[PDB]
Subunit: 219 residues, 6 copies
């Protein structure tokens, strides 16, 4: 990654064994549960494109997902190239060349180039641009790997309402509902999919109940 040292200047530091192992182990343990994405983002703080590729390439399973991710990255790289075409022919001696989409993705750029861009004044944030492409891809993966529709999350007859709600919002998260829908669902699908006893109680509370209010009511 690129860090500020103890003296305020931005320099390259090797990716740490702890960071490498943390990411491999979260993928092993959680696969593409939604919470793996914010973990990826945090563990890749400051990353160069080289570091992001290292993190993705150290994953041993999930190769269908990794090939889907490659495809997303290639789409975003192509759109970059559409928006930001680069001069053909020779680089000005000693000067910085402009990045292509494949330079952003770290396949045609060197670490030195990458450091040059990321530490330029002002920075050309190749690491952050690539990380956005990767996260776009990983969200597609999360949605693909979500095993259950929200329509099929219904409260069991002897299921504690809190347990039901946890299943409901875990499913909405994987299915990638917007926050508007998460906030809205409380007035609707969450009640509809409740068991008959809680549904009666929730219908009585009337509209505009907070989730806290609904959860207290059905405790």
């Amino acid at each position: 990654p690129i860090v500020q040292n103890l003296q305020g200047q931005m320099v390259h530091q090797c990716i740490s064994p702890r960071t490498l192992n943390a990411w491999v182990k979260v993928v092993e343990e959680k696969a593409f549960s939604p919470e793996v994405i914010p973990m990826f983002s945090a563990l890749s703080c400051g990353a160069t494109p080289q570091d992001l590729n290292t993190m993705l390439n150290t994953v041993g399973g999930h190769q269908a997902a990794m090939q889907m991710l490659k495809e997303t990255i290639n789409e975003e790289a192509a759109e970059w190239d559409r928006l930001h075409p680069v001069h053909a022919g020779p680089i000005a001696p000693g000067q910085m060349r402009e990045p292509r989409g494949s330079d952003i993705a770290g396949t045609t750029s060197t670490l030195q180039e990458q450091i040059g861009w990321m530490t330029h004044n002002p920075p050309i944030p190749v690491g952050e641009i690539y990380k956005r492409w990767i996260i776009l891809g990983l969200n597609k993966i999360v949605r693909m790997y979500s095993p259950t529709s929200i329509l099929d999350i219904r409260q069991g007859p002897k299921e504690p309402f809190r347990d039901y709600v946890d299943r409901f919002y875990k499913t909405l998260r994987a299915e990638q509902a917007s926050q508007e829908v998460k906030n809205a669902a409380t007035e609707t699908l969450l009640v509809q999919n409740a068991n008959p006893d809680c549904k009666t109680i929730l219908k009585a509370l009337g509209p505009g109940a907070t989730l806290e209010e609904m959860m207290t009511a059905c405790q």
Copy 2:
């Protein structure tokens, strides 16, 4: 987080893998037992709003709780906006804009903005303001998830008084009794809810016995 380096200036540092894993694992192990809150506060020392969101978003279960927390945060953000309305229209070039409630919560502000506020002289402590909202929300959660009323904590006939007292004050803590009530309860509900043999002994000691004195008496 924002730290002071080895040379006394406040700078951003990436959240560490150890901090990320510590928080995920405490939630896995303890859920919303009351002692998880001081742990959250300590593990988020120095945090930016980005870092607080990272910590909350890396939690995989408990999504009913996380949706309740979102609701609390939105209430506090709305109250901030009531108290501290911001100018509409364009920012003075190069200058710092004033934070909105959603800027505090990290959803409409960038990391750079956040660092700018938190390192301003004097700081506009967006991380600490957000952390207070979050902790308000988490306390609501702890209270919701407390499984037992204090009324139902009574000493068993062969239960060591120390064991009973531990259950009693663990319950008062989750139920969020004030410290006045915790200090008061010793003169009352703790005795009333004691078994007959200890109750006799405690009633005899008379008023103003310390908890130490009561515990010695019923050993």
Copy 3:
């Protein structure tokens, strides 16, 4: 805690995840065995009152003990206030106010205040003052939780004398005997409570035998 950086100036550093987890886990594993107290003292090296409260508040069980500790702290705070009363009314602008007992204990003081006191020239050592109160309280707890009188530690007929001595001095430690008594006990209760065969051998060695000498004799 407050540390000296690499350049010799005293600054605040966040409590580390390793320190947080070390303390929780020692309480989980050892409860209030006497050796937990020196561990607490070491793990709280440099602590502010905020940090000491964090350490105490991250403990999930033992709430009878934690309420006993609160009571001790309140007694010491009241004695501080008796010895060091503070001016009522407004603070001199920009200047440091004098700490009250509750400021020492971190309940009415901010982290900034605490850092101010602890880094004043000369320091007003609020962290060390509070840590002394806490340790006074924890020693009371250790004594309360000691399960066995020294009178009841007697050597079994087939118990190795070394094993007996270990039980004896582990018990004296929990019971909080002074060092005078620990050094004295060797001439007396340790012999009296020995089995008949070792008692014969020890009685023969005569007075002024070292513990090493007694242990060799009964090997």
Copy 4:
């Protein structure tokens, strides 16, 4: 490795116990699964030839692989010597000598020599040159140790298409197919090797389906 300290100058640092143990343990756990290579590259960030040899020599099993690697390194060293012959006879006093292939590989050079080359302006990147030879060798090993031809990866009748795709691309990776072939295979061998039900569905989608599209179709 050679790192930049906190003050911007390139200096030698000892290889860490964490790095040493991470590499031994990844070889123990994964042997020569393809993802071990990017792990090696990351764990050897900044390495001198001494450090790369340390990493390879700390492996206890896999000695057939390690002898194959020695053979690769000797081939690359011989090609270096063909391209970059060095002066015979005495070194200019106090001056840097040019590296031979065996100097690159760390067998005839000292750590001091290595540091000299790697910190020269401009650097003679002996660590990076050697690491390229090693990785060439390790890729040969991965290909050798791949247990299954792609021809033999076919979807079972009750095998989820996602599971099949994961096996397919894990095999292509070990077999060291180019990225062109990985991207191409989607239009062909992946369909051909699908079970009859998915094959029907995929054949219907028509050409130019993304992997995401194929995977959705056969869910």
Copy 5:
């Protein structure tokens, strides 16, 4: 401990959680096997008397040993006081007082005093003086806790000679034989205590065989 910072000046640093846990766990696992002593010495590198007491006081079992150690320390402290008597009466204002034996042992000195002595030019090495007393005591403990005389280490009839030799020299180590005796024993007791078949072979090699030579001979 007292360390040199990154800038070459000697300053106090808190004892680390890793060091605290390493020592507790080595005592738990190995008790007073001889190799615990060099471990203690290494883990206490740079220690103040406060730190050495912390390490000894964090041990929960072995209290017979810890009382024997207290006795040794008191003997060494008394001998210090005989050799280095200190002025009675008041300290010169602002100046350093001379340490007494109990000051060395950390019971009557403050951390500040200790740092003052250890960082004086030239240092009065209170930490190293105390560590020598402690190690004298711990060696006595190791010898006491050695379970077997060297006379009783004899090779079994089907015991590999290497296994026998390991038992022999592990016992000599615990019994605290000098190095002269360890080097000598090879010509004598080690042969005498060998089984008849190896004894024949060793007797034939003649005098002045190395241990390597003896071990090869009886392989």
Copy 6:
């Protein structure tokens, strides 16, 4: 060890708990398998003779090996003394004395002396000289503890050739064959010791086959 700080000057640093535990645990797990030696060398990067002795003395078993090592060290020390005799009589005040063999080995030198030599301009590399003696000794140990002659490594009738080759070269390594012999063995003993089916196939390939070629052939 002696390290360069963050500012480029060579100073002493305490051996770390991680390094201490890594070495003890590798000896516990691997004993004197050949790969323990490069691990020792890496874990002792920068070591003083004090640190090397600490590492060797923290090993609890293997005392026959440790006594063999002492014997090697004494031989090398005696040869040092033959090559580099030192002046008898008093040291020039304030000046550095020349090391004897026992000074190199850390038994008659202080840490301060050792640091003085190792940080002299130019250094008198006592740590590196001692480490060479130790490694000479440890290699003797590895060879002694190798359980099987290469003559006895033959391919089983249903043993995969790769498995056989791994056993073969693991044995050559422990038996301490030169690299010439390791490279040569491929043309000979490795074929001779192959099962009849692979032997036929290897004999047909003809001379000068790479190990890769032989391994492919017998897959």
